[PDB]
Amino acid sequence: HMSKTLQRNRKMAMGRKKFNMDPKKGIQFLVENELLQNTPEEIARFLYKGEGLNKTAIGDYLGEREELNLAVLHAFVDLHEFTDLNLVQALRQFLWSFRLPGEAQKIDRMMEAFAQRYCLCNPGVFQSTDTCYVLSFAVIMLNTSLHNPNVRDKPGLERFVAMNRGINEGGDLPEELLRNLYDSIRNEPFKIP
Ligand SMILES: COc1ccc(S(=O)(=O)Nc2c(C)cc(O)cc2C)cc1
C-alpha cells in the first residue's frame, strides 16, 4: 500500500546518501530496513546500477578485505559482459563503473578480478591471465603517456610493441593486437569517473 511505499522510497534515498558518507553504514541501513537483500549478487547489482551512488564510495566498498565484500567484488565483475570486446573496450567499461581506490593491494585485487573475467569471456585472446594483467596495466600506462602533457615524449607504436616482448608465455603478442590497442587508446583517452 501507498504509505509503506512512499516511506520506503524516501528511506531508499536516505540509504543512498548514507552509503556515500560511509558505504558499510549505507548498506547496513538498506539491509536492516529490508530495502536491499543481504546477498553478494543483490549488493553487487545495486552497485552496478549505481543510482545516486558516488563512484568513489562504490570503489571503497568493493576494495574491502572482508569476506562479503570480496564476494560482492567477484559478483560485480561477473555483471560485466566482455565477450567479443578487445581489452581496451573492456577496460573502458570496467574503469567507468567505479572509481578505483588509492591503495595498491585493493587495485591489485580489482584488476586481477578484471583480468580473470576478460580471459574467461575471450578464451582465445590470452592464454595466461598474467599476460592479461600485465597488458591491462600497459594500456593504462599508455593512456597516461599519450594523453598527459606532463609526459613530454609520447611513445610510438614500435616502442609500445617493444615494451611488451616476452609476456605471451615466453613469446610475444600478435603485432596486430598491440596495434589495435594502441590505436584505440590514441584515438580515445580513457574516461575517469
Ligand atoms: C594504478 O591503477 C590505475 C588504474 C587506472 C588509471 S587511469 O585509467 O589512467 N585513470 C583512472 C583511475 C585512476 C580510476 C578509474 O576508475 C578510472 C580511470 C580512467 C590510473 C592508475
H helices of 22-79, in order, are 23-32, 40-49, 55-62, 67-78
Is-contact 175 161, C-beta < 8 A?
yes
> Residue 184 sits in which domain range?
81-193
185 CA distance to ligand 1 middle (Å): 13
- The dihedral through the CA atoms of 111, 113, 118, 119 has a sign that is positive
Total of domains in the chain: 2
For residue 178, which of 188, 163, 193, 190 has the smallest C-alpha distance? 163
Hunting for cell 543481504 — which residue is that? 38
Question: Residue 151: CB within 6 Å of ligand 1?
Answer: no
94: which residues sit within 8 A by CB, 6+ positions away?
Answer: 77, 80, 114
Evaluate: CB of 143 within 6 angstroms of ligand 1: yes
One-letter amino acid for residue 34 of the chain: E
| Number of alpha carbons in the 13 Å side-chain half-sphere of residue 77 | 21
- Contact call for residues 112 and 133 (beta carbons, < 8 A): yes
Q: How many CA atoms lie within 13 A of 159 on its CB side?
A: 9
Q: Are residues 193 and 111 in the same domain?
A: yes
Residue whose C-alpha cell is 560485480? 76
128 and 161 belong to one structural domain: yes
Concerning whether 103 is annotated as a catalytic residue, the answer is: yes
Q: Any idea what DSSP says for residue 93?
A: H
Same domain, 54 and 103: no
> Same domain, yes or no, for 67 and 147?
no
- Is 107's C-beta closer than 6 angstroms to any atom of ligand 1? yes
Residue with cell 609526459: 151
Cβ atoms 88, 184 nearer than 8 A: yes
* CATH number, domain with residue 105: 1.10.1000.11
Q: Is 50 in the pocket of ligand 1 (CB under 6 A)?
A: no
What are φ and ψ of residue 124, in 5° steps? -80, -15
Among 32, 34, 81, 103, the active-site one is: 103
- Chain-centre distance for alpha carbon 188: 18
27 near 36, Cβ under 8 Å?
Answer: yes
Residue 67 sits in the same domain as residue 90: no
| Three-state SS at 154 | coil
How far is residue 100's CA from residue 62's CA, in Å, rounded to a whole number? 9
Both 105 and 146 in one domain: the answer is yes
The protein residue whose alpha carbon is closest to atom 2 in ligand 1 is 107
In this structure, are 70 and 120 located in the same domain?
Answer: no
For 28, the 3-state DSSP assignment is: helix
* 20 Cα–ligand 1 center, Å: 20
